[PDB]
């Protein structure tokens, strides 16, 4: 009587970090994600681990472009 399971890894706290309409500053992280569930749009960069982050001060805007994917933009103020 013994279990060969019992393992699991720490949760990674993924997901969107700033929702549409939120005021962000340049460098603010907007999305933590595995792969390109969201794609960087206007004024949004993407780091080696697919993290989306704002390139300028402004306002977050989401856009669903169908087969082109979902995008995150930052509209400057």
């Amino acid at each position: 009587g013994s279990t060969r399971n019992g393992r699991d890894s720490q949760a990674k706290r993924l997901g969107v970090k700033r929702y549409e309409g939120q005021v962000v500053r340049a460098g603010n992280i907007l999305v933590r994600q595995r792969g390109t569930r969201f794609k960087p749009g206007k004024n949004v960069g993407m780091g080696r681990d697919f993290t989306l982050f704002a390139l300028v001060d402004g306002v977050v805007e989401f856009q669903d472009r169908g087969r082109l994917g979902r995008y995150v933009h930052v509209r400057p103020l």
Binding site: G1, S2, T3, R4, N5
Partner: protein, 141 residues
């Protein structure tokens, strides 16, 4: 007797039994059906008992449709062990069944034969049942 030929996972969590049946609620093949009136995990042994009792009543003739399949592995710990030390071992297989499911249908047989075979079959099951005949409501689904 009935059980999956293969499976992705050896053991399933238990789940719930709320609600009317999800589908299988109309007669689809034969002339008469046996409908579940209450929820249960019907075992494979019970399905086979209901089946054998129906072919035994018919002796030679008719056709039995079994419309439930036991794909759910049933687990039990070895006798006298304490709680813990992992999930029990698979000891059998059950078909989840909720009120309104047509478990069995029969065809190619007289009304008296079907009413009686389905009645005996019902006595082998751990739930209340009801015998039904194909309607236009069935045909419209």
């Amino acid at each position: 007797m009935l059980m999956p030929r293969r499976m992705k996972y050896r053991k399933q969590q238990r789940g719930r039994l709320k609600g009317a049946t999800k589908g299988g609620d109309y007669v689809a093949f034969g002339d008469y059906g046996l409908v579940a009136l209450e929820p249960a995990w019907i075992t494979a042994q019970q399905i086979e008992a209901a089946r054998v009792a129906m072919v035994r009543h018919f002796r030679r003739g008719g056709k039995i449709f079994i419309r439930i399949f036991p794909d759910k592995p049933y687990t039990k710990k070895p006798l006298e062990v304490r709680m813990g030390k992992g999930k029990g071992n698979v000891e059998g297989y059950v078909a989840v069944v909720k009120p309104g499911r047509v478990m069995f249908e029969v065809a190619g047989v007289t009304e008296e034969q079907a009413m009686e075979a389905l009645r005996i079959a019902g006595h082998k099951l751990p739930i209340k049942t009801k015998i039904v005949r194909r309607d236009a409501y069935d045909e419209a689904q």
